[PDB]
Symmetry: C6
Amino acid sequence: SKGHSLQDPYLNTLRKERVPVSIYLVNGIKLQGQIESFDQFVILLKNTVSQMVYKAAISTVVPSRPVRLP
Amino acid sequence: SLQDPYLNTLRKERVPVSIYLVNGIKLQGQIESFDQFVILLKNTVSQMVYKAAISTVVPSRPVRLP
Amino acid sequence: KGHSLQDPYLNTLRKERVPVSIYLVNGIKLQGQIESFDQFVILLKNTVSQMVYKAAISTVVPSRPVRLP
Amino acid sequence: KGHSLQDPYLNTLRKERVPVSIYLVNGIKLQGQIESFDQFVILLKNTVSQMVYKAAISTVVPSRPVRLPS
Amino acid sequence: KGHSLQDPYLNTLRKERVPVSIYLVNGIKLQGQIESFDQFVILLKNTVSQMVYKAAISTVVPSRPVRL
Amino acid sequence: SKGHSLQDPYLNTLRKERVPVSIYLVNGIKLQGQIESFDQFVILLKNTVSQMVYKAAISTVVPSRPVRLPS
Ligand SMILES: [Zn+2]
Ligand SMILES: [Zn+2]
Ligand SMILES: [Zn+2]
Ligand SMILES: [Zn+2]
Ligand SMILES: [Zn+2]
Ligand SMILES: [Zn+2]
Ligand SMILES: [Zn+2]
Ligand SMILES: [Zn+2]
């Protein structure tokens, strides 16, 4: 296992399938919404209010319903 | 990147944003300028922010990238 | 030299479905099984599955002895 | 855009011996003048001089406005 | 080089099987013996082996003095 | 402006002249001792006794007395 071989498809699936996710920050704050876009550094989280999240600040990404990866 | 168009949009359009630090602290103002590692946030006081200490950037209003 | 320990270790936990505790850098403790992982993240399965960034992990503690191949 | 903003800013602050406050990621506030810097550290001069790792800095806040050109 | 200090330091602790304290950036204190290590993690053996990410480590403190 | 052009001379100086220093960690903690050595990633802090410190965990290094740098 190497590179983003898991992260990319995982996030890309949450995105393509517009899955409601909770994103827990290292500082203990919880964000919620849908992944609109992402790259090596950040994730765009769309909600009542959209926002750009730095991945280096993310602890865990918890999908609201189970997700199967290709 | 997603980061560059995003921030440059906020800059160009002078969008009021809230930057939450990696320690919970919130900063408010406008993205005056930025490079790969820092952002200049202009308010009644202008200040340089290290991206590495940012958790999330939240625009006051919705924005769209071309 | 960076992978020679980490990957065999994570893979072994994965292959043998060993229950692990994953302590986060903010002091929170997660539990489950290592379903998959790459260079940057780990997929942890419990009743509720979740993706964990390695950069937020301090330590990984298996529920029982794990021998490296 | 690389250091295009960071170098000029820091170099300007150093050149003009501008008083600054440096807030660390842990909320701690340092104060004094930027005497020098490299890719990783800043030398902050005051009654006590000290070497600050950039990785530990949240924000750098000048005591007065600065003109952008290095 | 890249590791001219870190490697010999950790290797010596691994060889002499010296009991060490590993303080994490978040305060917590781990204890045991360095069983093995690579560039990014340390395997710390106590009641059972735990893998410690180097990025989360503040300081490594041996129970007794060590010569490089 | 590039590399450890400042970090190395400074750290090398503290080591050469065996200056007592305080090293404040990102978590607030404060370590004291003398810089015995360092490389790209860590600093060896000689006290009673020697402690390896990750640079990634350090916020600031404060010498006990003023320190001049070469040229
Ligand atoms: Zn890998
Ligand atoms: Zn990716
Ligand atoms: Zn860019
Ligand atoms: Zn627009
Ligand atoms: Zn086994
Ligand atoms: Zn090495
Ligand atoms: Zn530069
Ligand atoms: Zn160096």
